[PDB]
Design a protein around this motif. Structure first.
Motif, PDB file in Angstrom:
ATOM      1  N   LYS A 245      -0.820   6.841   3.255  1.00  0.00           N
ATOM      2  CA  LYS A 245      -1.050   5.728   4.182  1.00  0.00           C
ATOM      3  C   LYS A 245      -2.103   6.064   5.250  1.00  0.00           C
ATOM      4  CE  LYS A 245       1.331   2.421   4.091  1.00  0.00           C
ATOM      5  NZ  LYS A 245       2.255   1.253   4.018  1.00  0.00           N
ATOM      6  N   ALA A 246      -1.970   7.220   5.894  1.00  0.00           N
ATOM      7  CA  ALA A 246      -2.996   7.660   6.838  1.00  0.00           C
ATOM      8  C   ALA A 246      -4.377   7.685   6.191  1.00  0.00           C
ATOM      9  CB  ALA A 246      -2.660   9.014   7.392  1.00  0.00           C
ATOM     10  N   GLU A 247      -4.423   8.129   4.937  1.00  0.00           N
ATOM     11  CA  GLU A 247      -5.685   8.241   4.215  1.00  0.00           C
ATOM     12  C   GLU A 247      -6.305   6.861   3.995  1.00  0.00           C
ATOM     13  OE1 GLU A 247      -8.023   7.332   1.011  1.00  0.00           O
ATOM     14  OE2 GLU A 247      -5.858   7.283   0.631  1.00  0.00           O
ATOM     15  N   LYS A 248      -5.490   5.916   3.536  1.00  0.00           N
ATOM     16  CA  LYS A 248      -5.938   4.546   3.326  1.00  0.00           C
ATOM     17  C   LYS A 248      -6.510   4.023   4.638  1.00  0.00           C
ATOM     18  CE  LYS A 248      -4.507   3.092  -0.916  1.00  0.00           C
ATOM     19  NZ  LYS A 248      -4.297   4.024  -2.062  1.00  0.00           N
ATOM     20  N   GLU A 249      -5.695   4.097   5.686  1.00  0.00           N
ATOM     21  CA  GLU A 249      -6.070   3.609   7.010  1.00  0.00           C
ATOM     22  C   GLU A 249      -7.411   4.160   7.482  1.00  0.00           C
ATOM     23  OE1 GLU A 249      -4.008   2.999  11.427  1.00  0.00           O
ATOM     24  OE2 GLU A 249      -3.040   4.268   9.892  1.00  0.00           O
ATOM     25  N   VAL A 250      -7.563   5.482   7.448  1.00  0.00           N
ATOM     26  CA  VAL A 250      -8.790   6.097   7.924  1.00  0.00           C
ATOM     27  C   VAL A 250      -9.980   5.487   7.198  1.00  0.00           C
ATOM     28  CG1 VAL A 250     -10.183   8.224   7.841  1.00  0.00           C
ATOM     29  CG2 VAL A 250      -7.832   8.268   8.729  1.00  0.00           C
ATOM     30  N   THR A 251      -9.870   5.365   5.880  1.00  0.00           N
ATOM     31  CA  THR A 251     -10.989   4.867   5.093  1.00  0.00           C
ATOM     32  C   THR A 251     -11.350   3.449   5.514  1.00  0.00           C
ATOM     33  OG1 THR A 251     -10.208   6.209   3.220  1.00  0.00           O
ATOM     34  CG2 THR A 251     -11.982   4.630   2.795  1.00  0.00           C
ATOM     35  N   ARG A 252     -10.360   2.564   5.503  1.00  0.00           N
ATOM     36  CA  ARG A 252     -10.587   1.188   5.913  1.00  0.00           C
ATOM     37  C   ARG A 252     -11.360   1.159   7.233  1.00  0.00           C
ATOM     38  NH1 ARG A 252      -6.891   0.778   4.936  1.00  0.00           N
ATOM     39  NH2 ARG A 252      -5.981  -0.284   3.101  1.00  0.00           N
ATOM     40  N   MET A 253     -10.904   1.943   8.204  1.00  0.00           N
ATOM     41  CA  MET A 253     -11.573   2.026   9.503  1.00  0.00           C
ATOM     42  C   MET A 253     -13.022   2.516   9.441  1.00  0.00           C
ATOM     43  SD  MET A 253     -10.173   0.780  12.115  1.00  0.00           S
ATOM     44  CE  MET A 253     -11.494   1.639  12.998  1.00  0.00           C
ATOM     45  N   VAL A 254     -13.274   3.611   8.739  1.00  0.00           N
ATOM     46  CA  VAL A 254     -14.644   4.098   8.650  1.00  0.00           C
ATOM     47  C   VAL A 254     -15.541   2.969   8.144  1.00  0.00           C
ATOM     48  CG1 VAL A 254     -16.204   5.785   7.616  1.00  0.00           C
ATOM     49  CG2 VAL A 254     -13.939   6.474   8.327  1.00  0.00           C
ATOM     50  N   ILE A 255     -15.039   2.230   7.160  1.00  0.00           N
ATOM     51  CA  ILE A 255     -15.770   1.121   6.553  1.00  0.00           C
ATOM     52  C   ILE A 255     -16.095   0.034   7.581  1.00  0.00           C
ATOM     53  CG2 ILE A 255     -15.516  -0.826   4.968  1.00  0.00           C
ATOM     54  CD1 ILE A 255     -14.342   0.941   2.964  1.00  0.00           C
TER      55      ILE A 255
END
Ligand SMILES: *[C@@H]1O[C@H](CO)[C@@H](O[C@@H]2O[C@H](CO)[C@@H](O[C@@H]3O[C@H](CO)[C@@H](O)[C@H](O[C@@H]4O[C@H](CO)[C@@H](O)[C@H](O)[C@@H]4O)[C@@H]3O)[C@H](O)[C@H]2NC(C)=O)[C@H](O)[C@H]1NC(C)=O
Ligand SMILES: *[C@@H]1O[C@H](CO)[C@@H](O[C@@H]2O[C@H](CO)[C@@H](O[C@@H]3O[C@H](CO)[C@@H](O)[C@H](O[C@@H]4O[C@H](CO)[C@@H](O)[C@H](O)[C@@H]4O)[C@@H]3O)[C@H](O)[C@H]2NC(C)=O)[C@H](O)[C@H]1NC(C)=O
Ligand SMILES: *[C@@H]1O[C@H](CO)[C@@H](O[C@@H]2O[C@H](CO)[C@@H](O)[C@H](O)[C@H]2NC(C)=O)[C@H](O)[C@H]1NC(C)=O
Ligand SMILES: *[C@@H]1O[C@H](CO)[C@@H](O[C@@H]2O[C@H](CO)[C@@H](O)[C@H](O)[C@H]2NC(C)=O)[C@H](O)[C@H]1NC(C)=O
Ligand SMILES: CCCCCCCCO[C@@H]1[C@@H](O)[C@H](O)[C@@H](CO)O[C@H]1O
Ligand SMILES: CCCCCCCCO[C@@H]1[C@@H](O)[C@H](O)[C@@H](CO)O[C@H]1O
Ligand SMILES: CCCCCCCCO[C@@H]1[C@@H](O)[C@H](O)[C@@H](CO)O[C@H]1O
Ligand SMILES: CCCCCCCCO[C@@H]1[C@@H](O)[C@H](O)[C@@H](CO)O[C@H]1O
Ligand SMILES: CCCCCCCCO[C@@H]1[C@@H](O)[C@H](O)[C@H](CO)O[C@H]1O
Ligand SMILES: *C(=O)CCCCCCCCCCCCCCC
Ligand SMILES: *C(=O)CCCCCCCCCCCCCCC
Lengths: 326, 326
Positions: A245-255
């Protein structure tokens, strides 16, 4: 020829009819209907009514909530400050001029406003850049034995200031210049006049290369790695529901962050490179103000993106606005 | 005398210099500077840029999230719709109108705009009233064996429509009237002209009593009781932190709601009752525009208060806006 040149300015309209007046001396209702100047104003007003509270609340909440006061948050404070410069140096000034129909503060006013206005947008920009270097550094740990702290956080802010000076200052003292743009109500760098006694050309390339390309490269590289490192670590802990979940979140944000950085500067740079390649084909005062709309409205969406969207600050914001707790 | 009359209107300026023109035929720049007209537009633009999304999102997110579609929420949907009527019937037309400097759609345009603007604000208000009757009914359980459901929910919505027709309709067909107000750009009920072929007096009393006092009384009574009931139950269950917390919280909201309701109508009725007492002492075009500011800007705060503020909808909103999940 579609423009009419003055000693301190370039009105993008043709004086064949002899109606063109200086943007420092009389309304420009011939290059845009007065109802459009009204909307210019409506817009500046929106930017203020949103921009000020959003960016102010940010400083104020930090002052009250101590967990927000990390060295890694310093640069976000820096961001809000710079957003405020944009509001009080740029937006309000433009509110006032749009309602007169021209730049009622003259050349020096032009410089003052143009300076603080670009100083702001540029500190904000390099803030977004520093933030990424910092984040990358602490997450990707590119250094043997290194711990990011206060001193670093600081130099980082100072760097943000030196870059912006290296951008806004030179026009004041011979390199490029400031002049009213678009509808002539606000002042900015002159990137659309081969004004030679000031080398507008070398400057725009400098601006393009050093204050757009580089920032863009640095940002992409830093966040690029950070997403790599994170997805690489997660893959190695697939048993941890939260980590995925943290991984998903971080990615979405960088995008969201990168898309945001693009939506804000690409337009400005697209227009610039175009003009630099397309010498002085009449550019509607209105059209000139599209690179400007995108960049300026960032002073509201940057704070929403980089601050408002954090369960933490968001929590404090509530407490504060809600008279103490809740 | 500070006014100048015309068959269909009342300009609050004196024609002693003979410069007063109809608010249906020429700009009113003699009773307000043009920049002030622009500023009017700015405000309408803000109302729209916030009002439309906030109220639209509210409908869209309902359509998407099953949980929100409960019979107690019907009235909050009604509220958003009413708000939209305010935004399009009122705000947009005033944006357009203000940039001309007068009511460019003429008498029956006046009536149209006046009608939908009034219909909106009134449905909205009675929506607020019904919501309290409903919450009071389910929490205070004032009836033998009653269960609030769909049928009831609906009654409620129908009821808000009838009360609002009962208020916006009459001025179309004899009782009171519509006419440009304040800066003459928007149209509203005439509550400041002894106009007698329309009994402007009795209608203002009828309005004061039946669409202010009554609502005021119902709201206070209903929430008064509710807060009473909730505080009584908690005192009887101090064992449970949760309960004390819910109680504390229900109260905070009821206060916020009541204060909100006052901030929105007290001014309108404050000016009204005064003028009913202070016969045609010159109320500037500005003066009369404040009772309208407080009311109109409600199309934005009502939704923030009565909707945005519940952690539930708020969660849906996130999901919705974030393209499906998060
Ligand atoms: C867009 O194009 C417009 C027309 O070409 C132009 O406006 C003209 O500007 C000139 C000055 O550069 C104005 O000249 C004045 O004419 C009036 C008489 O009608 C006088 O006030 C004055 O006469 C005097 O002449 C004396 C002897 O020559 C001289 O020494 C005095 O100082 C004084 O000038 C001027 O001659 C002319 O009226 C303007 N016409 C209009 C239609 O406004 C705009 O400047 C041009 N816009 C830009 C941005 O340059
Ligand atoms: C605010 O105060 C203004 C001055 O009292 C007033 O404006 C006047 O309105 C009258 C019409 O009621 C205008 O009367 C016309 O006069 C012009 C020539 O100056 C003609 O267009 C025309 O001439 C003719 O008059 C005859 C009638 O006796 C007849 O041949 C024709 O009917 C024809 O109209 C009119 O007489 C007057 O010009 C206006 N003057 C100004 C300053 O506008 C505004 O209506 C008033 N606003 C209010 C009270 O609502
Ligand atoms: C005035 O406006 C027109 C654009 O509408 C410009 O005319 C262009 O001239 C260049 C020649 O170098 C051509 O490449 C374009 O095709 C022309 N445009 C049109 C209308 O076909 C003109 O350059 C402008 N005046 C200047 C140069 O200031
Ligand atoms: C125009 O304004 C004047 C004065 O502002 C109004 O006269 C007022 O009448 C009240 C009560 O009758 C007096 O106490 C005041 O002397 C006046 N106002 C003030 C504050 O001085 C007059 O009535 C107005 N014209 C019209 C349309 O009635
Ligand atoms: C301006 C004439 C009165 C009627 C206004 C109707 C809306 C016009 O709308 C367009 C603008 O959107 C456009 O930006 C300009 C060109 O810059 O041309 C106008 O006619
Ligand atoms: C937010 C408040 C901004 C106030 C803006 C005021 C702009 C006034 O602008 C007007 C001119 O446009 C007008 O032609 C002359 C009359 O000679 O007077 C000035 O004050
Ligand atoms: C450009 C600088 C940072 C942007 C990197 C973002 C790359 C997105 O990386 C994508 C994820 O977004 C996606 O969820 C998974 C699903 O297979 O696939 C990954 O490769
Ligand atoms: C976005 C909403 C569009 C509003 C457009 C406003 C049109 C007003 O345009 C008026 C003309 O109608 C009038 O004839 C002259 C007087 O010389 O002044 C102009 O500003
Ligand atoms: C929406 C239009 C109102 C805009 C804000 C008003 C600012 C007040 O300031 C002006 C004064 O400068 C003017 O002389 C008169 C004062 O009596 O009108 C007021 O509105
Ligand atoms: C989920 O995280 C995806 C959406 C979140 C991104 C943030 C979008 C909000 C931006 C607000 C900017 C408003 C500026 C006004 C111009 C229209
Ligand atoms: C904690 O909740 C205490 C504060 C209560 C929050 C309610 C205030 C919301 C106001 C939003 C309305 C803004 C109107 C904008 C003017 C056009």
């Amino acid at each position: 020829m579609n423009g009419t040149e003055g000693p301190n300015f370039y009105v993008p309209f043709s004086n064949k009819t002899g109606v063109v007046r200086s943007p420092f001396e009389a309304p420009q209702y011939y290059l845009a209907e007065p109802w459009q100047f009204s909307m210019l104003a409506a817009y500046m007003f929106l930017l203020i009514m949103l921009g000020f509270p959003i960016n102010f609340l940010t400083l104020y909440v930090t002052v009250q909530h101590k967990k927000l006061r990390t060295p890694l948050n310093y640069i976000l404070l820096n961001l809000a400050v710079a957003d405020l410069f944009m509001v009080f140096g740029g937006f309000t000034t433009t509110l006032y001029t749009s309602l007169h129909g021209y730049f009622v503060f003259g050349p020096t006013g032009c410089n003052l406003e143009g300076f603080f206005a670009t100083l702001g947008g540029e500190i904000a920009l390099w803030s977004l850049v520093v933030l990424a270097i910092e984040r990358y550094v602490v997450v990707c740990k590119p250094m043997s034995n290194f711990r990011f702290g206060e001193n670093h956080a600081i130099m980082g802010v100072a760097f943000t200031w030196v870059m912006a000076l290296a951008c806004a200052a030179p026009p004041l003292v011979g390199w490029s210049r400031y002049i009213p743009e678009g509808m002539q109500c606000s002042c900015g760098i002159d990137y659309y006049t081969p004004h030679e006694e000031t080398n507008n050309e070398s400057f725009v390339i400098y601006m393009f290369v050093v204050h757009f390309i580089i920032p863009l490269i640095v940002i992409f590289f830093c966040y690029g790695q950070l997403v790599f490192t994170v997805k690489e670590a997660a893959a190695q802990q697939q048993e941890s529901a939260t980590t995925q979940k943290a991984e998903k979140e971080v990615t979405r944000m960088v995008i969201i962050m990168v898309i945001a950085f693009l939506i804000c500067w690409l337009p400005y740079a697209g227009v610039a490179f175009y003009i630099f390649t397309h010498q002085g084909s009449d550019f509607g005062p209105i059209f000139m103000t599209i690179p400007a709309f995108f960049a300026k409205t960032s002073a509201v969406y940057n704070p929403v993106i980089y601050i408002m969207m954090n369960k933490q600050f968001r929590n404090c914001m509530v407490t504060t606005l809600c008279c103490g707790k809740n």
